[PDB]
Each structure stands twice: as structure tokens, then as C-alpha cells.
């Protein structure tokens, strides 16, 4: 059946903005997962999980009689898809249970792991999501095998369909680099936003880069992909060594015995995949990655044996039974237990990527320190496991349950608690009047608030106006934020704030974070008055101001907008068309296509463009809140053509005289070209639509201002 | 960017069930198009359209100074996508303005026609939909040129995204038959549900079949395609000759001058396409189809000159300036006006498909009658043009406005007016108890109500339980409806009805249509009571009973369910997997994926399967409304394998003993295989889900019962 995507494979796809509708969700519109979870008996769930660990099922027998290793890997993979570039991936939406991740080759036999958890899921129902369950299970595995975890938070609501994530352009699973859709160029430069070295891998290739078993070269891939997952060297060594203290790999026979992945299997497989024709197909005969490595002498107990083995032997390159490259300890005795036969032992073995931890010079120093000081290794692994499994959960306000760690961590982008009375509606009116009397313009007020609030992304719930981090490094220096203009607005608002705060009694005070947002609201109100409309814009106080020392400057760098179509901004020339970048940003902001449309049209006429660019400013009454963008964009009296100097800028001329009326970018004109977008533009550019435009704009503006407000949720 | 569709091109697509979310709709959740329309000043809209017809725009100059012909073709193409097989296509959703229809080759330059209408659309805003305006414009064209239309109804609400329609499997526009994805097999048998001869055509090829200019053979394709759009021979001749009384074709130069269709065009084209490098690219130089034919001596006035020319001349095969086959009158004078140069005239010309009307023997008889009696022609055309443009609008209750024709037409599947008081809540309770006391079983009551209500399809809003057409030919004899069992249930309910109606005062009575649905409600309540749950199923009276004489038996044939996964029914062996046919039925029913899942799981345990098949009946308490379908389907203690006799039937055996527990079809087991469906089955198969299952089942049952109830809108 030929589809629009077949005919026009480069047209923009808006269906990413209308995922996650109430149509696909089986839960009622009022379901609130936080409330369900807070009534869960978490202790009962953990007892059931502890029981499960050693309750072997014959259809996927437990190695060493204990599923802990399999579950740790399951959780680590759940979390391990995360990319700091866009925040997408991670454990936080339980997407391991949907395509494509349920069928990635690196996720082989994690279908079995999830199936073992069905009876617990069924027992507790809506009170524990799959997303929370996967992580909780990892934690229980660790605790069952003697490792004390740093804590656990619930609150990852389940999702009901696959996320639209760019995982790469390759058309072959696991394709090595340098092909027609290579994710690598230059000196092994991985394309943003990717965080894995081959299509269908979590981070790196366990044999080495593109299969080449060189631990030093593998270390480079480890370091880059883990940095792209928000992990530094210490955290990386702690995680890999900690993980590989447990369990084993599976490669008992040739890979060609392994059948279809779950999304390709037959209906009778009932959601499972990788059925193997090798011997019994399971247990002692299991084939998962094709490697056959058992790291420690006690694979079901926390030990300091990983680093004893890594440093205590010299290693020789060998092959598993499936033909994969791995390493065996020279001259060692058979000290490693077998997973099924008590009369068998094995020599110590390692992956290429384990040896990276010894042969990369920067890892070797950390590895040695951990070998010499195992308490340091335990604490670092516990912290890094927490970070790994919570990195995408957002502000601490979203953490639920009785095991949330009290300690505030820098990676959480923490916001200080509010400890004083908040401004009321009378105070808000008085502060908006002060802001309007200061001489700040609609353009400056709107731009500043937009800059502050539109750093939010729903993918990992980072960013937003809470914290007033716009005033700190590095946000205050981002080019899209217009640093010199921003400084002048912030100095004015800070003087207003100091004067209001110094006049108060009690402990009442306003944060700069709230004032930035409030001042934006005053700008929108003033713009509406400029247009002859009487509008009050909703405002909710309670933001607090974070400090510089609570703001990790290197972690904040990924939130920098290099493309922000809402301000007609593009930092450089990219291979992705700017209107695709617009849709991508709207998805991060949680906007639908009508919301994106309305917002952008209003921002253009309010003066939100970076550098006061006239591109898309299709009005003769700038700083007034009108639907002029749409009415002028749709006027057939204007003809558009790309300019000779720049194929991405367009000139709109009167059709009868040739006279220049406007200029616009791709982001501007897509609203008059894309057949669905133009349908939405038409609604707002109709003669009956001015009051609808204003009200819809105010609603979307408010939505953006509140995106990070989980304190109010 | 590689997508799930790329990796698993044959996995089932559920996104067709989640279109049309409130996310994608710019109108508020409360917007009611009927209420907006009813306040439109339709007379003022028509005066503006009348003025437009002769107000030429220089970017697409009006042929003969009059846009009437262009707009008639626009409206005909809007309606002309309709197929009776599934009800999809047609004018009723305004889909001509979205992909792919906006860029079909047969729709070339209708982009210009729609653009001409933007000012009027903009003026009237939400009070007139694009979908209504397309049709209205064609009526006003006809009226302005001297043709009296049969009437006009508003009420086609606009849609905001493309419909998911199977338009064929060809990967090349206009591909000739006999390719690798041929829509023809056997002796020129067009595959259901298609109703056009080539990908991107409305009906047929105007040169002849696969380009062969033989009028006799073209007639065969005309007759088949028009029958598949619900038009008979009389209506077909009236439509084609009526349309071709007006306007002209456009083929002034070679087709290679014409550039990309709108979905492929550059962003600067602002939604238009087919930009032509031939001379001025428009007006006298226009190229649309490649043909260059002007049918009558007065292209901007209704006449009987099409048939005068068709019968008054002999025709010679010739070529247009673009090289297309077309026909010219032998020895004729230059009597046809030129569209732009008043000093030039041309000979009469015809399409191959026009000559069909004279050279096919059955058409010739109708065409002669019309030639001899042009008042007969005018009436037939007016009736057919109304039918064409309203055939997908649904029940007459959805018609709006002051020009709705009072005459009731058989094709409308009409329902008599109700002229008596309706039963009240107490009456309904009395009837449900009488039905339960009669000895009819849950299975009989559920199955009968399902059979009556589930003929509805949202594509053309035909079918449903209103009318009680289940008691008439042909529904009473459809195999899926179990004709002997149905007859027994209907005799019982009719006796209950006669006894209740005979006892009443004041003219209160209950229709059989209402009682069928109420009896089904009683069944569902009783099933719930069987499970230990007291529920009342909502019921809304006001259905009426249609007569056999008000039911067109041949038209009703396309509503027969040959595949109804909800009753585990497949009439024959198809090349499309049954699970695909389930999702297609769910889309026709207007169900989401959660609604489809709940509904199916409940129907299985209520006894709704055709023939009392045990497939999917995963319960030991049949006729009790429980979630047993899901809890048993998801039980990992059962292993499933295809049977040796039939690969589409599966046995579920206990994994440990081998004992046979269940059998199921692909429609049953898709819910335990598809990763999105299984996530939905999990919610209903959880230990906390019995109350939720019952409530959601009752809600979707009631939705299905009410699908045709536009009297309550
Ligand atoms: C460079 C990073 C890493 C690489 C290349 C990697 C590679 C793999 C491979 C290939 C397997 C074998 C899969 C199979 O055949 O069953 C595996 C197993 C496993 N990994 Fe990793 N790993 C990495 C990091 C992690 C981290 C960060 C953790 C957790 C903190 C983890 C925990 C596990 C555990 C527990 C297993 C054993 C599974 C079982 O017992 O069934 N690994 N690893
Ligand atoms: C066998 C069925 C049909 C065939 C093959 C067919 C074919 C065509 C083609 C090839 C053109 C020229 C497109 C262009 O070059 O501008 C056209 C024009 C047109 N057709 Fe048809 N047609 C059919 C039926 C109908 C029907 C049912 C009607 C309406 C009742 C209709 C009304 C018109 C009108 C009014 C025009 C002139 C458009 C103009 O003036 O711009 N046709 N036809
Ligand atoms: O984090 C330290 C400090 O950074 C900024 O310093 C400001 C100053 O407070 C402003 O009011 C204005 O004069 O510009 C300075 C330029 O560096 C923050 O604005 C401030 O809240 C924070 O304490
Ligand atoms: O059985 C189908 C049939 O049922 C009802 O008609 C009754 C009729 O009213 C009685 O006289 C009875 O003894 O015979 C029929 C039952 O066969 C439906 O209302 C009717 O339209 C339908 O044919
Ligand atoms: Cl994601
Ligand atoms: Cl459709
Ligand atoms: Na994420
Ligand atoms: Na339709």
C-alpha cells in the first residue's frame, strides 16, 4: 500500500507532534500515575522481586540459579539509550517494551527478562509502571547480590506507543562505519545527536571499534559515547566494572542459529524473539551477543574480583564459540564457575572493552584506585547507578516514594526550596506596572521570557525558567540569547526586584526567576493593548533562583539552542532543513502543531526574532499582538522567490508591481507551503479569527512559561 | 532517519486508529461546525462566489473570462475519489487539500482553483468548511451558467490531516496495468477496494485503457469504475455529458514543460504546483492533462450542444500539442470559441471517453434519449450531481441549511420520521426485564445487537442499527449474521414489541430498531451480573424502522462484513492477514486501539463469535463479562503453535503437560504478539482491572450502538 512518506519521503512529518494523544492511551484522561504509585506497597513489590531472582523458569533458565545479572543488564539497557544532545532515550518512558528498542540486537533476550516480570506487573497493575519496574528490578538484583544501592525514585509514567527518535540513518542492523549512511566522519566524529557507535547498540561494540579488538581504540569510543550519555571517566569506569562484577555473556554456539527479533517473529512467539536452534536454545546453550565471558569467581555476589582479575593476569586474544573476539587470562587456573554444571570451571575472561579500563591511561589510574580502595569503587558505582537510572527524570520534585535519596546532586540541576511568602495578585499587578513604566519594550520583555522558558525539553525534563539560570553562565552568553541585550534587561529587572524586595514586610520576596516570567507576561499584555485588546495573562509564582555553583556549566551546554525557529535563529548551516529543526524543537517543548503555529505567528509580530531580523515579521504594527503573520503570509498578492545570495532566504514581492514587501526564511514560509501547516495558518488568518488568535496565543505562552513547574503538578 | 516501518514493513499499523486527535485540530474541543454553519449567510457566500466566476486573476487567467468549468471539475474531483467498497474517499472531509490527493496528476491545477477560493474562505472563516465550499462553488458555477441544481446541503466538517486510504500498491504515478503491483488481474478485474484504473486517476484514462484510444474498450472501464462509485449507466452518461457541457481541457504544449506536483514543489511555490515553463505557463498556454479539447460552442453556458456535437459529426483520431490521443470532428467548420482570442475559432473535439457515450451500445441508447429530450438530460444530471456530491454525507439528519432537497432518495438509505412519544427510562427497564424473561441468552442478545449496529462505517456514514435493516433483505441473509439464529431472535423480540406497543396509551410505541439495541444492552447487563457486577448500560431511544421498499438491496451489498474480527469471522481466504482486516474494521467503526482491544476481549467471552466458535473464547465462564480473555491470553504457562491443518489457527497448550487449553486465530493472538496491542491487553489483564474492563467495555458498546445517531447530534 503506497503511503505519502513513499511518494514524498522528504516532506516534513508532523505526526511526531500528535503522538501520545488521549486516543492511544488506555488509561482514563484523569489517570494520575503519581497518585497511583504513592499508594503502592513498594516493600511488598520488592519482596516479590527478591523471590523472583531465584525462581527459575524452564523456558529461560536462570544462570547460576539467579536472574540478577540478566536484570541488571535489562535495567542498564533501559537507561542506556539516553543521549544528552536531545535528552531522548533513557529509562524514563519504558520504551524498551516497544519497537524498535524491543528488537535492537543489543537488547537480545531482554524480552525474556521483561516476560519474567509480567506476573509482578499483573499483580500490582497500574500502581507500578513498566518504566519504574524495570529500574526497581535492577535495584533489587543488586541488593539481592549484596550491593547496597544509593536509593530509588518512582514516577516514570508508562507510555503507549513508540517515541519518534532519530537513532541513525543506516538501513542495516549493526552496520560498520563508513557506509552510505555513516554516522561517523572525519577523525571518528560521531554525528549529533547520536550516542552509539552502530545502529542497534547501546553504546559501543564489545569486540572493539568496528569489530577491531584494540582496547585502546575501544576506550576512545567508550569515553565519547558515555560522555554523550552524561557520564565522565570516573562514572564510566565505576559503571562498567560494577556491572561486570555480575553475571555473564552468552555465546555458546554460532549466531546463525538465532532467529527473528521480536518485531519480525511469528505471531505464535507471543511477543518474544531470537529463538535459537542451538541445542536446547537456552540456559547452558544460550546465545545473546555471541560472546562467552564470565568475569568473576562469584557471578551472583558483589565482590572486588573484577579488578583483581583485570590487573592480576595478562590477557590473550581468543574467540568465543560463535567466533567473536574476546580475551582469556594467560596461564590461569579454571577458577570461574560454570552457570549450569557444578563439575566445570573456566579460566577468567574479559571483553575488549573491559581491557580498555586497564590499557587506556586515564582509565587505568581510576581502575587502580578502585582496585586499591574498593570502598571508593562501591560508592562511586552506587552513585553512578543512581545517576544512570534517574538522569532523565527531571527535577527532584518529580521523585516519588520512600527511597528517594536526600542528598542533592549537581546533575539534577537543583533549585533551592522556597522558604518565604510568595507574591499575590496585587503584588503581581504592581510589579507588571513597574516593569511597563521602566521603559523595557514588548520586544525585550517577550524575548527575555522566551529565552528563559524555552530551554525546557520534555525528553529529559531539563531546562525551563525555574532557577533563573538565564542570568548565569553559560546561558547568559549564548548567542541565541542576545547577550548584550539580555544583560541590559536583567539589570533593569534586578533593580525592580531589589526595590520591591526591600519594601516588603514579613519574609515576602520575589525571585528573579518569577520576575523574568512576570515581565514577559506584562509584555504580552502590553502587546495586546497595543492591538486594542484587553487581555490578562495568567502567572504562577514560586520559581526560585539557583546559584552558579548549582549550575554545572558543561552539562548546561547541551541545552544551548543552535536552532530556534521561534526566534528565527540558526547558529550555522546544517544538513537538516530548518523546518525539520522547528518541528524537532516543538516536540521538545511538548507543543502540538496548532500550538507551534500560533506561538510562532505571535512571536514574529512581538519582536522575538534574534537580532531584530525582519524575516517573518509580516506586519506594519510590530509589538502589537495581532494575527498579521498569518493574514500576510497567505496573501496571494505576494509572490515568493529564494534570493541569489542565500537560497534559504526568500523575498515576497507584489505580484502586479514587483515591489519588495517582505523577506522570510524557510521556517517562516513552511507555514504557507506544507499542506497541513497551511491549513492551520488559514484558521488563524481568517477574518473571524483575531480573538481566537489572541486567546490561543496566551494559552500557549502560559504553557511554555510553566513547562518545568513540577512543584505545582 | 530509519523508522519502524522501514525495519518491519509488514508489522501492523495502529496509527490509522489515532488520527483526528484533538492535538491536531486547531478548533477548540467545543467547536461545533453545524452550529457555525447554521448561522452562515449562505446567500451572501453564493453572491461572492457568483462574482468570483468572472473575476479573472492574472496568475491563472479564466478561460473565456469564466472560472465555472474549472470549479465544476474541482468539485467533481473532490467527490470523485469515492469508493462504495469501503466508503472511503469522496468530498465529505475536504481531503483534496491534503496529501496525496492535492498532488494526484488527475488533480493538476486544482491547486489554482482552491487558491482562488481563499479570499471567500478567509472572509467567512469557520462558518463554512473547505469541504462544504468546494461543493458549493461547483453548484454556484453551474447556477451562474444557467443550470438549475437539485439542491445543496452543508455540514461536511473540515479535517486537519490526511486520511489513511489504500489507493493501490503501485510505486509509480499513473503506472500502466500489468506491472509488478498491478491493480488488475484475470480478464481486466480491478482489485477491491479500488475504483480507478491507474494510480493518481479519479476514474479512467481519458485517452483509453492504458492509453489505447478505443471508445468501446474505454466504455468498459467507465462502467466498472462508475459502478464502484455507486453510479449506474444513466447517471454515468448524465454526469460525463453534463460536466463536458462546460469548459475545456488544457494541453497547449509538451508535458515535459510541467514541473513538480505541490507536495514536491519548492517552499517558495507556497502550496501550488505544476509550474509550467511553456510560454506564459497559464491561460492560453496552460497545460493540465495534456489534452486540448473544448466540447461546446458555448463553454460558459448550459446547452444541449455536447450531444449535438457528439451525434452530429464523425470523429477522427488526432493528437494534442502535447501528444495525447484525442478526436476532432471530420470536415467541420471552426465553430468553437477560443478561450482568449476572440478572432479565433476551432473545430469540435472530443475525448476517447466522450465517444464511449456513443459507441457503447447501452450508453448510446441513453445518450440518444438525452439528445432528443434535453429536459430529461438536465433532470438526470441535476439528480446525479446531487448524489455525486452528497453520497458520503450520511443520514439526511446531517444535512444542513436552506437548500436541502425535500425529496427523499433511495440511495440515502432513508429512515422514517418518528411521529410518536418515545419510551422512557422506566419503559426501557420494563423491556430489558421482558427480554431477559423470554429465555433469549446473553449470546443471542449481544450477537444480534452487534450484527445490527456494526454495519456502520465512518468513511461514508452508512450503516448502523437505525432502520432495523437487519430484518430485511439482504442483511437478514448475510452469513456473518447467522440467518436462522437471527430469525429466531427477531421473532421473539417482535412478539415482545407487539405486546408492549399494544399495551400503551397516547401513541407511545417502541420501534424494532430501538428494541434490538435495548435487548443487546440487556444482554450486556446480564453478562455483567453473571460476573457479580451490577451495571446499567446507557440506551438512547429514537430509532425508526425502515421498509424493504425504502432499502436498495444492491447498494446494501457493500456493507456485508466479509471479515469481522470482532465475531472471529472471515468469509473466505484473503491475501491480507486477518489482523490487518481487524484494524481496518476498527477504523471504519471509529475505534481507537484501546477501544478495539476492550471490545474484542469482551465480545469473545460474551459468545459473539459466528457459529459459536471456541476460537479466542478464553474463559470457563462464557456469558459472564469478565477480563478472562486478557488474563488467559497473557499467561506464560501456555505455549502456542499453528495447527497442521490450518496455519491460521493456533493451539494453546500447557507448557509443562502438553494439555490442550484453547484454540485461537490470528485475530485473537495478535493481542499477545503486537507490542502495542499487548501493552494494552496487559492493562486489562492486570489484577486491578476488572472494574475498569467492565466500565470501558460498556462505554465502547454504547459508542457502537450510537454510531449512526446523527438525530441526537
Ligand atoms: C562499554 C560498556 C559496556 C559494554 C560494551 C557491555 C557489553 C556487554 C555484553 C556484550 C554483554 C553480554 C550480553 C549477553 O551475551 O548476554 C554484557 C553483559 C552484561 N553487562 Fe555489560 N557492557 C557495558 C556496560 C555495562 C554497564 C554500564 C552495566 C551496568 C552497570 C553492564 C552490566 C552488565 C551485566 C550485569 C551483564 C550480564 C548479563 C547476564 O548475566 O545475563 N554492562 N555487557
Ligand atoms: C469518464 C469520466 C471522465 C473523464 C475521463 C474526464 C476527463 C477530463 C479531463 C482529462 C479533463 C481536462 C483536464 C484539463 O486538462 O484541464 C476534464 C475536464 C473537465 N471535466 Fe471531465 N472527465 C470525466 C468526467 C467528468 C464528470 C463526471 C464531470 C462533472 C460532472 C466532469 C467535468 C469536467 C469539467 C467541467 C471539465 C473542464 C475543466 C475546465 O474548464 O478547466 N468530468 N475532464
Ligand atoms: O552568580 C553570581 C551572580 O552572577 C550575576 O552577577 C550580576 C549582578 O548581580 C547583576 O545584578 C548585574 O549587575 O550584572 C552582574 C554581572 O556579572 C547575577 O545577576 C547574580 O544573581 C548572581 O549572584
Ligand atoms: O423472524 C424474522 C421476523 O421477525 C419479526 O416478525 C414476526 C411476526 O410479527 C409474527 O407474526 C411471527 O409469528 O412471525 C415473524 C417472525 O418470523 C420481525 O419484526 C420481522 O420483520 C422479521 O421478518
Ligand atoms: Cl524517547
Ligand atoms: Cl478518506
Ligand atoms: Na528521554
Ligand atoms: Na468517505
UniProtKB/Swiss-Prot annotation, chains A, B:
Binds 1 heme b (iron(II)-protoporphyrin IX) group per dimer. The active site is at residue 77. GO terms for molecular function: catalase activity; heme binding; metal ion binding. GO terms for biological process: cellular response to hydrogen peroxide; hydrogen peroxide catabolic process. Heme b binds at residue 244. Bifunctional enzyme with both catalase and broad-spectrum peroxidase activity. It catalyses: H2O2 + AH2 = A + 2 H2O; 2 H2O2 = O2 + 2 H2O. This is Catalase-peroxidase. There is a cross-link at residues 76-203 (Tryptophyl-tyrosyl-methioninium (Trp-Tyr) (with M-244)). The record marks 73 as: Transition state stabilizer. Pfam families: peroxidase (PF00141). InterPro entries: Catalase_peroxidase (IPR000763), Haem_peroxidase (IPR002016), Haem_peroxidase_sf (IPR010255), Peroxidases_AS (IPR019794), Peroxidases_heam-ligand_BS (IPR019793). Its cofactor is heme b.
